[PDB]
Q: What sequence folds into this?
């Protein structure tokens, strides 16, 4: 119900309120509602057909609201999660909820890393250093999948008798994506 | 030429081939948290989708 | 209706039993109420005293507040230092007063460009505590200030500035002008004088 | 017991003798019906307008039919069955609606679209009046083939005879719904299964194969380009053929096999061979459906596998 959140003296629109905004398909299950300290509201939406937990709202030690923001479509099928932390403080009746800022960019980066990068989470690159990628063999079927994904029905990419299959220049992005995207990650390039 | 194009029904298909599992494009609650109009189509899709048009009509479908 | 206007604020609710018409005010009621089945047939009048009867209330930290319609919204004492030119112009005093836990309006009267007031608003913010707020007092009879000001306010709110109410002095804006302030500026409430 | 009632449009009358415990509900229908009739104009020569007394009776005949169910008993079952008999007895000289339609084309005011209307109405009516098509009919052809002065050969068509093949399936579903609804639905479902049942069949049906949907809401029917590609067009064409077999069989008063018996043999052209094979394996209605399954589950695999073998690619503009 509190319309606004706090971020370092600045007032943002309330993110919780935002994420729970109604819409066909979403389902909220409040458990243990009557006792404050143990309550756990849980949002479950249709993800790739079947229903699944997307958001998890509860308290933590020392008055810290936590909004577990969950992404179900991952690299290994094992759901990843972004821990959003908010200081609840009943002494400021007007803006009780403020966001824990220390390290907010880092948490968001860590979750993106697990989704993009098949490597260990190390944000200690020199932005000026060359980033080596990985070797990459172009399978006949990775091409079928890509062409059909973007809708490119060029015969140069379709397996025909007595012709080697060609890959779309577009496919370059599939190969370099991990080497390139890594470049916006270092700590010296702190971004949200 | 002036051609008619269309963005996909869902974004999962492009995300799978490309390796862009960015939730912004696939999960409504992330899209909504970032304050986007919805689950934005992959800008990369439009890149390859439009390119295909140029490839077809401008290069006479000679990939080369 | 005569007796009604005698009693107005005291919770008595007159019904004209002999006429089926309509009151644009719902000041009183006509023939219908006497017969209606819905909860629409049971309409009572406000009793100021009770309706708006000051109260007390406790923080978790156990602070006490004089609970009224006003403080219930703002979350502080129902008392404010109104914008004043010489006095409220100083970012120092609007900070100090707002830090003492009270609502104060930063005086527009002493600023002459978006840039100069942006200077103060930023000084005020530097001295005020985290999550704290204040407001801005602008003069209607000064169309110049009102022209760089309203924008500066909107541009500032968009960046997320802790300035969360506008008061307008010297006159009451017209419906279209006011509506503008309300929906355009990201303000929690608007103050009219 | 009889008490006059007029079915009316423009300068076209059809006087309708009505039974006693009936003329009440009869007149009620007559009125409601009169409301729906579009205003007469220049020899009723519009597209909604009945051209002739015959067509009009078919109209009203179809209107009354719209308000009945075969499962539960209705209050118009009385009137429907009566207008049937008077339409039959008055306008059909015993022959088929089809013979009438032809007469109405040749002689009277030609409209193919109106002809189809008249036919939809009569068959539809009759079947919802719990009054089936079981009694061998006097098809002069089938009578003479049966005697020995004639012999039949079933020939079945192939791919590529028409730009809009799927259209033929529509007119069939839409017109003779009371005869073909079964195997359309049966096929639509059994094809749906083949796609789950099969590994990567799903990938070939880019825009799905909801046949029943496209039929109901033309709005949702995919491009000719989608409908024409084999994986969906092969099976569908077959359903069209099977469907035609059935209107012929059902409407003659024959079982699938009874129809098949009058045949010196059968044969298909290209993909039509399949249904000819499957048609001859056919005996009784209960058994008719596995015969259908065989046919369309062959076509489905021809379609899906041959597409996978050599799939169409962009033509250099």
A:
């Amino acid at each position: 119900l509190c319309s606004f959140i706090t971020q370092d003296k600045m007032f943002v629109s309330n993110p919780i309120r935002k994420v729970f905004k109604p819409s066909q398909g979403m389902v909220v299950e409040i458990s243990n509602g009557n006792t404050s300290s143990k309550t756990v509201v849980t949002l479950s939406e249709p993800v790739q057909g079947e229903l699944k937990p997307t958001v998890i709202l509860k308290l933590l030690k020392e008055n810290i609201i936590q909004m577990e923001m969950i992404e179900n479509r991952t690299m290994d099928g094992k759901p990843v999660s972004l821990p959003l932390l908010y200081n609840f403080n009943p002494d400021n009746g007007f803006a009780p909820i403020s966001e824990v800022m220390e390290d907010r960019n880092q948490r968001i980066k860590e979750m993106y890393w697990k989704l993009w990068i098949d490597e260990p989470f190390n944000l200690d690159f020199d932005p000026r250093d060359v980033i080596k990628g990985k070797d990459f063999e172009i399978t006949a079927k990775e091409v079928y999948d890509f062409t059909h994904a973007v809708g490119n029905n060029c015969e140069d990419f379709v397996s025909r008798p007595d012709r080697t299959m060609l890959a779309p220049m577009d496919f370059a992005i599939v190969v370099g994506w991990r080497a390139i995207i890594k470049a916006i990650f270092p700590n010296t390039v702190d971004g949200d | 030429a002036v051609l008619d194009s269309y963005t996909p029904s869902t974004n999962e298909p492009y995300a799978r081939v490309s390796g862009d599992l960015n939730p912004i494009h696939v999960s409504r609650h992330f899209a909504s948290y970032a304050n986007l109009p919805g689950t934005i189509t992959h800008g990369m899709f439009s890149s390859a989708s439009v390119r295909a048009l140029i490839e077809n009509w401008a290069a006479d479908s000679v990939s080369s | 209706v005569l007796t009604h206007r005698n009693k107005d604020g005291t919770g008595v609710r007159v019904i004209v039993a002999g006429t089926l018409d309509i009151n644009p005010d719902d000041d009183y009621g006509f023939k219908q109420e006497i017969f209606d089945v819905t909860s629409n047939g049971l309409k009572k009048n406000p009793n100021w005293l009770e309706e708006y009867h000051p109260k007390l209330i406790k923080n978790k930290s156990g602070k006490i507040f004089v609970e009224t319609k006003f403080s219930k919204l703002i979350g502080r004492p129902p008392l404010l230092v109104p914008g004043m030119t010489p006095c409220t112009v100083s970012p120092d005093f609007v900070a100090a007063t707002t830090n003492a836990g009270y609502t104060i309006e930063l005086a527009g009267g002493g600023y002459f460009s978006a840039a100069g007031m942006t200077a103060a608003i930023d000084s005020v913010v530097s001295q005020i505590e985290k999550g704290s707020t204040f407001g801005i007092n602008l003069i209607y009879v000064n169309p110049f200030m009102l022209q760089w000001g309203i924008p500066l306010i909107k541009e500032l709110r968009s960046k997320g500035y802790p300035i969360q109410f506008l008061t307008i002095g010297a006159g009451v804006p017209s419906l279209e002008v006011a509506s503008e302030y309300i929906e355009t500026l990201g303000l929690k409430y608007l103050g009219l004088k | 017991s009889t008490r006059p009632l007029t079915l009316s449009h423009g300068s076209l009358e059809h006087v309708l003798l009505v039974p006693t415990a009936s003329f009440f509900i009869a007149s009620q229908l007559q009125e409601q019906f009169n409301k729906i009739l579009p205003e007469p104009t220049e020899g009723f020569a519009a597209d909604d307008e009945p051209t002739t007394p015959a067509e009009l009776v078919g109209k009203f005949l179809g209107y009354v039919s719209s308000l009945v169910e075969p499962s539960k008993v209705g209050q118009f079952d009385q009137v429907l069955n009566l207008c049937l008999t008077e339409f039959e007895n008055c306008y059909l000289e015993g022959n088929d609606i089809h013979a009438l339609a032809a007469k109405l084309l040749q002689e009277n005011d030609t409209t193919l679209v109106k002809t189809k209307e008249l036919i939809k109405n009569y068959i539809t009516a009759r079947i919802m009046a719990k009054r089936p098509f079981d009694k061998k009919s006097n098809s002069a052809l089938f009578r003479a083939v049966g005697e020995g002065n004639a012999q039949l050969v079933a020939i079945f068509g192939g791919q590529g005879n028409t730009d809009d093949y799927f259209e033929e399936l529509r007119d069939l579903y839409q017109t003779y719904h009371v005869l073909v609804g079964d195997l359309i639905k049966f096929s639509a479902e059994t094809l749906s299964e083949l796609i789950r049942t099969t590994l990567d069949a799903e990938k070939v049906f880019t825009q799905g194969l909801n046949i029943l949907e496209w039929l109901e809401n033309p709005s949702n029917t995919p491009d000719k380009d989608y409908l024409l590609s084999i994986p969906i067009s092969c099976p569908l064409i077959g359903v069209i053929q099977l469907a035609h077999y059935v209107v012929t069989a059902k409407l003659l008063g024959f079982t699938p096999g009874e129809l098949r018996s009058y045949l010196k043999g059968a044969t298909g052209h290209s993909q039509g061979l399949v249904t000819a094979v499957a048609i001859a394996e056919t005996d009784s209605w209960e058994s008719f459906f596995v015969s259908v399954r065989k046919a369309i589950t062959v076509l489905f695999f021809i379609g899906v596998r041959c597409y996978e073998a050599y799939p169409n690619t962009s033509l250099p503009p």
